[model samples]
Target: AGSAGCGQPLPPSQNPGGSSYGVNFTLSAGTQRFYRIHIPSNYNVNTPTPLIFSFHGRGKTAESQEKLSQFSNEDWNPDAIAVYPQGLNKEWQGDPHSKDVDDIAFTMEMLDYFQEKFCIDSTRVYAAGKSNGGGFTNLLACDPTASTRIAAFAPVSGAYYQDVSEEACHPTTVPIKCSPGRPSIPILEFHGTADKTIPYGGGGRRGECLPSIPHFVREWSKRLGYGLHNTTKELYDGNVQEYQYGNGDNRGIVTHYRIGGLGHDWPSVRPNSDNPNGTYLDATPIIVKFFKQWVLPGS
Candidate 1:
């Protein structure tokens, strides 16, 4: 068995092999936190399945993240267990507006909890999020413990605000100095060029500096020891632009999608609140594919 819960029977649930809420646990800080989970119907007790934790935007609920990401959609992905974790007071701890909760610790707790309760592929757990949640996802990828457990990361329209020197930072001048658990940690980011909530061009916001999308990914590549040689491609008749950083086997260690005319919204084929005309690309499947390309180093 490669996981703690492998070969164990599924825990009884009102929504067996489906999505459920009301899942909560007490944190080390003495706070009760909750999350929503989706167990695939095809989940095999003897087989290890991948796990995905999807986080919601600031002021949004776990339920909203479940619907927005659709990671639990069996038709699209019926083998992986999906998790939607609720942020403290509807905000994740990473950016300026976040509460002081230890979200990274909470994330580690969830990984252990699920691996002990479900037939999870310990080497294939992943994290993804939108907006503030996306920024927090990046934070998790930077954490030693959380990054060691998570196989990959995908942030959609992330609000990457960095605090430097007593809550002060300059847009485009602030440096990102995150240390990952391992080198070459895979990261895929999606951002809309026209996003106003968290502009793509980068700027000062809420007493922090927001790194531009391109700069953010570039910094990650450099931190991972990847070279700056990059390649680019255009898709959807120029509606979408894909950038791949790094060279050789490190190619695409950090990937980004710059969507033309898109707002601060997750890219989906269907219309959403921020994208009334719908997007030409769907990030869910794309992210899953990217996650499949990576795993815990030894596994």
Candidate 2:
């Protein structure tokens, strides 16, 4: 089970009722890497199921992310398979300010492994993550090859674009390079207005860096071909403000949900940390519903 750089270590059970499996595989980049997968109840091999790749924040493991997200419950949709992939040294590779782990390649390899073993609908593959995980999601969205495989992406409290400046990060404002004929993908971003860890306004703390939230959205919106006139805004969960970009024949949209006073925490039903006053908007169901509307080319 162990790959070149990764030692396929087994996962210890954290959830009393949930079943978890660990896949210690390498990305073939001359380094060993690891990741874990969690399947909800009644997973059938005969039928194809939606796959969710959830990444963890900095300094967290895949097992920890599974417990924090709590997507294993029957209420979290029993039909889908949830996979949590661990990053090397608890960090992504493209973050030049940090240890610069090679996460982009690892993610690509992880999805390939999942598709080969399970009946995963290629067009229905999706990703969601928190903090560093969220940032990694943004990085994936920026990748040309990976973006095609991903139907929709949801990055919560994560930053966008490479850590390097515009000149250093080729294709600056636009993460995905524009090819003559390329399909558009949908992205849903959620951030806390009061977030201090990553900062809502944009600045780096301890080395992690990203563009301002406004700049990040506007840049990606243009690259996705979203028109300024087609954009719309609504009140999400009766309190939070949500913005959506309307464009393309495929209903390609990019949404950003701004939590009024929430910080860098998962939007769950129960409190797992000290943020009791914070809100858990149940983002899993909502993001899945969004993904169901769009499909990758050729299915």
Candidate 3:
């Protein structure tokens, strides 16, 4: 309600590159947007640095995500500039029935802004999100205009396929919208088998069916022709399985992490005393590790 208990990162003026903090952006005369960027302490403007664009789910702010997502500070990618982008009113644009926020255009605008402002490694521009944000990243994977700008993507607790909305006056179904081309980026998804919010299995109202996590992985896996590969391991409170689908090269892949018994959680952050949000294991390190393995490359 009030502040979401997450301290705000320092504002970095309109065009960021200053101190790796939030930057206010305006696409047009009256449209204003904001995103939080954090360059590692040891970063140098002369050297190109990889960036991680992190997104928060619905009802969350970039500040909250930056603090609790553990993508910032030394716990994660210590040398990469981590970005926590705020959603318009705490939600993304891919939702079929939502207002016209034009998040895709907004994202491209930010990426262009960051490229010119900082020494960014073009080939290493990556995206990751949780829940609603995660679903948004899925949009990046689906749409080439955005995918061309990103090297890879990571979606946790949410992955979806947008279908074409038929309603003229009020569009209902929103898929990639743009025709699908053979995707060229790598994707990693961390989903829980017991997640009810988004559901690992898949379910939604008004024909808004969430893509099945397994099916989601396979769709991209099939694209790679590398087939589905799996390796299970023990974890703090739940079993973890890493599914790899690639040629083991930069050609691209679809890696899925299936966490048993875990629910709708971003991992690592404890949900509150009386909340059964889900089990978590410090996944920031693992996520960073995953992002490091891929480069500009898709679907």
Candidate 4:
């Protein structure tokens, strides 16, 4: 069920006013966490609009994410509300260089705050991020409450460190303890074969154990009860490969993209910080389209 803010008209004071891209806002989630939000021009107070939270990578700012991800652009996303949350000290939980803040609790606090302040379609809420931010997004999916609240998840060049180890962890056989509460949850991931920062294959970084990209994706498929049935297809003139994992039905509960020659970049046709020259596939549009296909099951 939605909170007291559903169907309530958002006041002008709460709207983005500065540059039209977004407005900066702060919340007291135990320690004055900050976030920037973009309210689409087509937003209707009476309508239950979708909300997407985009988290920045380690040492990245919310404003930079707005430019890099481009989810705030009305032309790119059209109707959905976009949010960029600032991580404490430009870092998120689940990593060695992370703050001691309870980011998962902060995420829940933000959800409650949004539902109490805007007419958000609770079922259509989504989460996406890059690098360390992407890792945190995976944490959200693993969490019982966030996994149920957020409709779908998408991560680009995620740095998935083993949940238990921050130092001297197994490289090739690293295990991730992810248990989503939902029977079937949508997960989309993008990685590059040439990613040096977070390799396609398993490795260690700053003493944190990172699972192989394929291995981590496979883990999610199993966690979502999608089984081992999977298939792969080439797209973008062989520049990209798409992997699909099915759960008895034809639908792929878990989707993964392996890009050729790309390095720690978000797959986008338009230039971004990571992929300054662009890539074979545009990930932003694809992610938005995927998000439209799901919602909180009961909602």
Candidate 5:
């Protein structure tokens, strides 16, 4: 396969406070891939840095996520590196009901490649994605190998499925071993109460059997050894619901943010989306802020 293209590097003006670069690489089997890596101004080559892997929604590209997440903004954190990796053919594999792809291997390959070029703090590596990308995050969390690499995960409006069982409507037919053990990796899930596409309560169109955002948290909490006593609930924005799990153990806590009346759209950093009735709360800043509070493994 030909070498993937690395777009023009971010210029001094474009990277006044930090640096951004594009890298293209083909997977082991020769599938073309492109991704962007942003190094904050505070990044010191000698010091290990945390890496945040941000995946885009279905049909979206890595460049789209870089723009949507606005990681390049002057006000955004200039200390960590944010990576936006594009999906192959605009789709991720292992949706349970959808066609399967080799996204897991692809992502792992991407991470390995990047670590060689940057001083990535392995223990602090994290993942976040929206929509289908978010689903990919959940799939990664369910994989023992991939989960080990991720210290925490934030899946926005995505569901979790281990196999194609009744739980997974379309059913893969092939039995998939469930990933056991609660990863010490923390999780922060965001979902819109009115998400029509994925549905907050699951059982959506296309036989999409997604675990409700809350259900996923509870299940994972239990798996991590957090008994019912450790689970807690808090009210956010006055009425919105927030769930938390874990009590300061090797298993990091899991959190879910349920936005009322929001739809199948990315949480806007602005007050509203194009819809007048839509409530848009910038999730990017909040996610980044939360990420700063946790480190990878030994960090």
Candidate 6:
């Protein structure tokens, strides 16, 4: 069992399997949080299942995340546990300027919460998010306590706000550095060059100011243990530019998929005409296959 806070002991599990759809918990900070779950069709409590967290974008619901990413669908994971955690008021504490929300602690506490309820594989816990949630995933990738639990990361149309410093400087030099004590886990990201919601080429609205997509990967390259000299890129299927920084299959590398005409939405097989920003290039299956590389059976 784990404590809600560092000292406050958390309550016992209400469900032993990851079959509940709507589960909630209120943090000591008074932030009410909730997440939806989808257990494997034939889940066995006797064996540890790989736990995967998929976060939704800002102003989006956890239900919407699964619909778009298809992470909870059987096509994505036949036997792994899928978690889609809801954000507070449709926003995450991914902002570098904002630190009081305690979303990081909430994730850690939630992990502890799930471990008590479900059979989880400690080595294969992973995270992925899109847009605001994507930025939050980046936050988890950097967090010391949470990172220890997550095996890899996959952020799509993300903003690396944690990279910028509050301090001003002469000649205007900045550090979009990854979290310390890393250079270990792998990360795969997907982005659209035409994204207007997020500045794909970097500089953006007041609170969303960030470095370019490749710039974020450059800083994370060696930091994720990919090694500085191993970074390489090639045109993937015409419209997508694939950046491979370490392991080709991304067990310990950083891979990026940059789509030319896509915009601020998750890439899907069927594009939404209502949302002109959507893409025809579906990334869900690719991500599904990538995660298959790291799961430790019954870990």
Best by lDDT: 1
Global lDDT of each candidate: 0.83, 0.67, 0.68, 0.81, 0.67, 0.70
Q: Estimate each model's TM-score.
A: 0.94, 0.81, 0.80, 0.92, 0.80, 0.82
lDDT measured at residue 223 in model 1 versus the true structure, 0 to 100: 82
Ranking by lDDT: 1, 4, 6, 3, 5, 2
Query: Residue by residue across 244-271, what tens digits does model 1's lDDT show?
Result: 8878676777999999988999898997
Model 2 Cα lDDT, one tens digit per residue, 1-299: 21221222222443223677776786676777777777656655545667788888878788888877665655765666788887777766444444646677777878777666665667677888888888778777777777877777888887553444544433223343223124466778877788887666765444434566656666666666675533444565556777776655544377777777778777765676525654747666777777777666673
Which pairs of residues have clashing backbones in candidate 5?
93-101, 123-296, 123-297, 124-296, 164-172, 269-282
TM-score of 3: 0.80
Which stretches in model 3 have alpha-carbon errors above 4 Å? 1-20, 28-30, 159-184, 227-238, 248-252, 269-280, 297-299
After superposing candidate 2 on the true structure, give the runs of residues whose Cα lies further than 4 Å from its correct spot: 1-17, 97-100, 164-181, 207-209, 230-238, 248-252
Worst 10 residues of 6 by lDDT: 1-10
Candidate 5 matches the true fold with a TM-score of 0.80
RMSD of each: 1.9, 5.7, 7.5, 2.3, 5.6, 5.3
Model 4, 40-60: lDDT tens digits are 877776677788999888889
Candidate 3 local lDDT, 1-299, one digit each (tens): 11121133322453323444657889854689898877677666566778788888877899877765667666467767788888887888765554878788888877777676677777778888888888888787777588777778888886463452223212222222332235545788888887887777664533555656777777676554666664445555547776676664533367777878777787764662213453556667777877787776422
| Clashing residue pairs for model 4 | none
lDDT of 3 at 39: 63
Return the clash pairs for model 1, or none. none
Candidate achieving higher TM-score, 5 or 6: 6
Residue 172 of model 5: what lDDT?
21
- 2 or 3, greater by lDDT: 3
